[PDB]
Design an enzyme around this catalytic site. Sequence first.
Site, mmCIF file in Angstrom:
data_model
loop_
_atom_site.group_PDB
_atom_site.id
_atom_site.type_symbol
_atom_site.label_atom_id
_atom_site.label_comp_id
_atom_site.label_asym_id
_atom_site.label_seq_id
_atom_site.Cartn_x
_atom_site.Cartn_y
_atom_site.Cartn_z
ATOM 1 C CG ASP A 109 -52.707 44.060 -5.904
ATOM 2 O OD1 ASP A 109 -53.150 45.165 -5.483
ATOM 3 O OD2 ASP A 109 -53.049 43.582 -7.008
ATOM 4 C CD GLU A 115 -60.440 46.917 -7.583
ATOM 5 O OE1 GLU A 115 -60.289 46.377 -8.710
ATOM 6 O OE2 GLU A 115 -60.556 48.156 -7.402
ATOM 7 C CG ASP A 152 -54.399 38.830 -8.919
ATOM 8 O OD1 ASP A 152 -54.740 39.932 -9.407
ATOM 9 O OD2 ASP A 152 -53.428 38.161 -9.355
#
EC number: 2.7.11.1
Length: 254
Positions: free
Chosen positions: A130, A134, A148
């Site tokens: 991912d 962002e 993240d």
Amino acid sequence: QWALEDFEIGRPLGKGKFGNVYLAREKQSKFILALKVLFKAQLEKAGVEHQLRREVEIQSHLRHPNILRLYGYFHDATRVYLILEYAPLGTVYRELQKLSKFDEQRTATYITELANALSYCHSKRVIHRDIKPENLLLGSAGELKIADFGWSVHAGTLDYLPPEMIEGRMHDEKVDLWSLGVLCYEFLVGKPPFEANTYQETYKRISRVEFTFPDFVTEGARDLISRLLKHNPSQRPMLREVLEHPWITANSSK
Ligand SMILES: O=C(Nc1c[nH]nc1-c1[nH]c2cc(C[NH+]3CCOCC3)ccc2[nH+]1)NC1CC1
């Protein structure tokens, strides 16, 4: 170990479906960090708790200048708290809206930094998956920091996902190199190479590796992105070659 009464909460740094991240200061240390606040409530609802405890594992036992530290965690009644390293210069997403598009030297650098973080990660059989703007923070030195590790894994938006993943197939740590290609194109061009208006059209677009370059994207950039964005994982360079690439080296400050 830790508990809420140990911290002083400051300004919201941002949002997300499961809650907010806040700037915060550990009371007796005066240490500055980011508190990611997650409701148990919602984590259970959308059945992600198994993912969460994996984000904590992986990112905890990880140690790299280009990977956002996770120091610890804790909970109570209503929620779960992640004690994150604080990255003073925000997300690369924001810088990109800000500048709309980066230059070759800045791009180069991020790719390098990124390559290294992933180099380190794969070593431990950790695959991120991912990797999107962002999800990339910036240190005070202005340096990239992969955040993240939510979806992260051992052994929603399609834009960054490679053909294999999307098609429901065999995927290894080559995913992260397709990702790097997408990133790399997005940095220079200002939108990801497979952007579309529908899930459905993006799927096709990724599926068939349909991308084109605006005129200003230089030959060396085309080269590296072209080598990275292969339908077939096997033909994607190893991280080492990305570092060694002559457009990188010509430009990669860091
Ligand atoms: O975990 C998150 N962020 C962070 C984790 N650790 N550190 C952050 C973080 N650092 C930030 C730094 C800035 C710097 N800007 C502050 C406002 O003026 C311009 C510079 C902003 C947000 C940050 N989030 N998630 C938030 C994006 C939603």
